[PDB]
Amino acid sequence: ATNHNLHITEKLEVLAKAYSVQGDKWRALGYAKAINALKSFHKPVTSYQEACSIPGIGKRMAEKIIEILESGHLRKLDHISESVPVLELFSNIWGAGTKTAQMWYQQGFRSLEDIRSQASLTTQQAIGLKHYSDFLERMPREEATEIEQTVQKAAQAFNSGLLCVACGSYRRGKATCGDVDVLITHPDGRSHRGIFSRLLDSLRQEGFLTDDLVSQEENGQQQKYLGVCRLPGPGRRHRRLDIIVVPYSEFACALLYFTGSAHFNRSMRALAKTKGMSLSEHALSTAVVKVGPGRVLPTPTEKDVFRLLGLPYREPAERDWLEHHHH
DNA sequence: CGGCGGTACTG
DNA sequence: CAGTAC
DNA sequence: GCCG
Ligand SMILES: Nc1ccn([C@@H]2CS[C@H](COP(=O)(O)OP(=O)(O)OP(=O)(O)O)O2)c(=O)n1
Ligand SMILES: [Ca+2]
Ligand SMILES: [Ca+2]
Ligand SMILES: [Ca+2]
Ligand SMILES: [Ca+2]
Ligand SMILES: [Ca+2]
Ligand SMILES: [Ca+2]
Ligand SMILES: [Ca+2]
Numbered sequence: 001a002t003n004h005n006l007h008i009t010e011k012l013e014v015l016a017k018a019y020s021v022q023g024d025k026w027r028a029l030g031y032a033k034a035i036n037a038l039k040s041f042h043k044p045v046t047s048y049q050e051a052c053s054i055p056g057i058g059k060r061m062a063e064k065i066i067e068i069l070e071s072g073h074l075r076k077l078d079h080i081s082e083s084v085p086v087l088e089l090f091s092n093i094w095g096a097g098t099k100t101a102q103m104w105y106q107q108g109f110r111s112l113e114d115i116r117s118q119a120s121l122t123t124q125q126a127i128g129l130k131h132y133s134d135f136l137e138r139m140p141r142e143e144a145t146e147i148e149q150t151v152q153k154a155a156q157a158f159n160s161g162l163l164c165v166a167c168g169s170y171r172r173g174k175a176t177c178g179d180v181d182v183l184i185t186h187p188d189g190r191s192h193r194g195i196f197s198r199l200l201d202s203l204r205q206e207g208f209l210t211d212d213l214v215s216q217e218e219n220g221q222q223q224k225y226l227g228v229c230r231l232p233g234p235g236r237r238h239r240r241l242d243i244i245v246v247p248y249s250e251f252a253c254a255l256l257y258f259t260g261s262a263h264f265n266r267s268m269r270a271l272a273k274t275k276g277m278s279l280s281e282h283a284l285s286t287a288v289v290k291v292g293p294g295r296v297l298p299t300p301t302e303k304d305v306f307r308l309l310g311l312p313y314r315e316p317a318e319r320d321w322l323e324h325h326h327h
Numbered sequence: 328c329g330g331c332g333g334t335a336c337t338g
Numbered sequence: 339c340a341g342t343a344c
Numbered sequence: 345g346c347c348g
Contacts, residue, residue, distance in 0.1 A: 016345090019345080024345090026345065026346090027345045027346095028345080029345070029346085030345025030346050030347095031345060032345090033345080033346075034345075034346080055346090055347085056345095056346070056347090057345095057346080058345075058346050058347080059346095060345065060346085061345070061346080
């Protein structure tokens with residue numbers, strides 16, 4: 001775009017973070033939409049009226065946008081609770097969300113050392129905690145490619161016809177990635193089955209996977225792996241890796257889901273529901289509603305899902321937000 | 328005013 | 339079930 | 345927070 005309201009969005013984002021770490025998620029959702037709407041606007045907002053006219057912006061947000069626009073900052077930023085930056089710190093641990101972070105706060109911890117030395121930690125959070133720094137860093141797009149190639153090469157050693165694709169921010173074209181998302185399927189509709197057993201064992205053998213966060217290996221029909229990998233060679237960081245294995249008939253919906261963004265996926269699914277459909281990572285489904293399951297519409301490609309939702313195909317680089325348009 | 332995406336693990 | 343995650 |  002070119003954010004024409006940069007000075008405004010900066011400040012609303014601080015505020016938004018604050019609700020977000022305090023656990024006030026709907027409020028934080030509201031801020032995020034407004035903020036995207038400001039960023040995409042053709043010009044600096046100049047009037048309260050013009051602010052309210054924007055979908056995503058109502059009275060309370062227009063008051064703020066205006067106050068910032070005239071007076072040059074936002075009072076409310078100097079009343080944010082002091083606990084917020086601790087709650088953010090604790091929430092940046094993988095596996096600890098706002099509840100854990102609040103529990104730790106009421107136990108009086110205020111730093112990661114208070115966490116290590118005294119807090120009770122789930123298995124996941126202990127892993128989250130020891131890799132705190134590495135997991136906060138975004139990786140270059142090129143390290144993501146090598147991670148994906150590792151997973152793919154290990155998969156094709158078992159079956160050369162297996163399809164592997166990196167999704168997430170990578171597929172949306174970004175320069176850096178918070179974590180790598182790999183989608184595996186097989187066009188024969190069948191040989192995706194039992195992959196995780198073999199694939200995980202192989203990736204552990206040569207030391208690439210260093211920890212597992214979610215991986216239900218008791219289940220032969222396991223569909224997801226969330227864990228931690230590390231490319232070989234000196235000084236490499238530990239990275240988050242997510243792998244999903246799906247049947248080929250689910251490929252377009254899984255691809256769409258895994259490409260995201262999160263906000264994009266939410267809006268798509270909200271749209272589907274407005275049309276008596278249901279959109280998931282597994283399928284797009286018609287005639288919903290206790291509720292009734294409705295039937296799967298076949299969707300051999302992502303274009304089919306867009307078409308059935310009455311939208312034009314959206315290129316992966318333009319899937320940051322649904323309500324963001326224009327070539 | 329109530330709804331705000333739909334689903335998969337963990338414990 | 340609540341919590342966290344994708 | 346905003347929307348229907
Ligand atoms: N709450 C969520 C989270 C993710 N998603 C979907 C499924 S996984 C895909 C990408 O999500 P990630 O959290 O890896 O974000 P991105 O890849 O966009 O960015 P970075 O990893 O931060 O580079 O989005 C979702 O539908 N709902
Ligand atoms: Ca509006
Ligand atoms: Ca966390
Ligand atoms: Ca590939
Ligand atoms: Ca991810
Ligand atoms: Ca990602
Ligand atoms: Ca396990
Ligand atoms: Ca309310």
